[PDB]
Symmetry: D2
Subunit: 116 residues, 4 copies
Amino acid sequence: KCPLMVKVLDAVRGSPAINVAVHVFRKAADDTWEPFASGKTSESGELHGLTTEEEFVEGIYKVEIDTKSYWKALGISPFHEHAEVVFTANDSGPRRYTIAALLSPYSYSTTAVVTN
Amino acid sequence: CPLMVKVLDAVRGSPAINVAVHVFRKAADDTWEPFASGKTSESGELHGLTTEEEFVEGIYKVEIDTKSYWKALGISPFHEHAEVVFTANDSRRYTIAALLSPYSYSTTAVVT
Amino acid sequence: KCPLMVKVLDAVRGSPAINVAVHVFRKAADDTWEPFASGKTSESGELHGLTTEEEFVEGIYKVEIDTKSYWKALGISPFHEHAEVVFTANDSGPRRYTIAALLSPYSYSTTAVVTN
Amino acid sequence: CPLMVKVLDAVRGSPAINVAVHVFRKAADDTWEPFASGKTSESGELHGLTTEEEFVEGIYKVEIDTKSYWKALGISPFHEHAEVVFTANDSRRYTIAALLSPYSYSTTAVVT
Ligand SMILES: C[C@@H](CON=C1c2ccccc2-c2ccccc21)C(=O)O
Ligand SMILES: C[C@@H](CON=C1c2ccccc2-c2ccccc21)C(=O)O
């Protein structure tokens, strides 16, 4: 299985958010953010294949979603620079994580679905 | 003010102004009687709907006319309206807040 | 394809909302709500097979999600009686509709994803 | 009050009380300088963070300590915290509102 997936929806058009840039970081032993994985959502607004179970070890992760470039190419000037989701992962063994974000120019919501 | 309504616009980051709101009480025959109504003010709020005397235990529906709000802004919406249905009992002050987007809304109750 | 699907998530547990009752109605020519379809979300919190393209004609629909029974069997007394989503469908030809609801005891959110 | 914070609890339908909030300004070297902080009051609100003089154009991050809030209630949360990152420019009053659930939060900006 694929342990980390990202799903993005547009709440203005009622559609997947397509071609949204995503960057994932893991908190360093030295207290800082190391690049972990990056990608772009597809035509269904999903991003698969960021990591593997082997490489996705315990840690603190930050999933940064580049909402402002997205809204920009649609002629919108949004409030947020981006949407960042920060969470501890795999601290009681391996899990599968989907991080969904719902986007509006001045609002966004994010929910995590974690299965075992 | 036992019952207040607060509407926001997630496209523009602003109160949602002049939104028609209709409130209904469920009658014993299972249908909705009009109870209160109004339009949101400049701060997206609607106060003075009921009084403590009249706001007795029961099932109330609050209906927010979101489709007109979007239509007047030139934006095409998904929902006919947004409806919030709950039971008021005595075991407070109720704020019903709604956050609007054309294809998405949320609603939260703040009970204090 | 399957023209109307419902997806329900629990925002307290970060999981699909399983065994959630859903009732769909269509607005009558005589101004009232006729029963159109009903079902229960599965282990992924999805409900498929409510209708067919042939039977899913233009109209106004109401998708009622029985949030209070759900929260009740988990020992929670929620605010809402249910979550109802009301929308015009297929008014410019057939579409596919997913109605997602996100649920918390005093809050819920619903978004529609409409594709063609 | 150029910048205000409003936190709500979606599990209990109540303001989120005594939530630590830290605000940062981005420094020219690309790092976050502490700027303002406080705890939400009984009505889930935090006022008096800055003044108009000090709140100049720039990128600000607001960080809401949601994990402590849930931990103190005996409920296990998903996020380390909730962060809102935006640019303040002069082309207002900013309310940053956050609606919290253990595995889900939303944030909306009301700019008037
Ligand atoms: C996304 C959530 C958040 O609600 N946002 C609120 C909100 C946003 C800006 C200013 C005041 C409020 C407020 C007051 C009482 C209850 C909720 C709010 C929703 O409206 O469902
Ligand atoms: C906060 C928004 C977001 O919806 N979340 C979705 C969501 C979250 C996790 C996995 C799949 C989905 C999905 C698929 C189709 C449409 C919506 C979603 C809501 O559910 O109201």
